[model samples]
Target: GLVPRGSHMGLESYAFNLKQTIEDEKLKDKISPEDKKKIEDKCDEILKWLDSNQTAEKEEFEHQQKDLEGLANPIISKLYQS
Candidate 1:
């Protein structure tokens, strides 16, 4: 009695990608330690939320994904601009 969908996958994708992006940038020394730690902490927060709230709804998944993207996007753009 439930519908299957890609919302969860979408969130997972962004979460991993954001973390990977940060790691890659950090490796290049493009991101500062403070920024890196902040992103890492935020990623931990999201992953733990996902683990604890296993029954989150579809909109919740999309919103979480957006939140990750929002946090990372500006940093990413700035990194690439340099």
Candidate 2:
């Protein structure tokens, strides 16, 4: 299957953005120690996964995006819900 280059970029941006978000001053105290650790760890895991899975299909990238978001969205909502 032909891979869409955009999918890989989106995953890269999304992972890095979440990594940055975790360091936000406003959200620093709001996010729990465990949650912060997990997000950072997952971001590293995804970035490394990308390094090794350079030829992954677009759908596979989207699946990884969904998996990361499933873990990130609720924690991110904590910052926005107020």
By lDDT, the best candidate is: 2
Strongest candidate by TM-score: 2
TM-score of each: 0.71, 0.84
* Candidate 2 per-residue lDDT over residues 1-82, each given as its tens digit: 5456676777888999998888988777778889999899888989999878765877567677788898899888876755
State the lDDT at 25 in candidate 1.
39
Model 1, C-alpha of 12: deviation from truth (Å) = 1.4
lDDT of 1 by residue, 1-82 (tens): 1213465555556676778877773455888778777778778788887766655665556577677778777877877755
Which regions of candidate 2 fall more than 4 Å away from where they truly are?
none
Q: Candidate 1, clashing residue pairs?
A: none
Candidate 1 TM-score, true structure as reference: 0.71
Predictions in order: lDDT = 0.69, 0.82
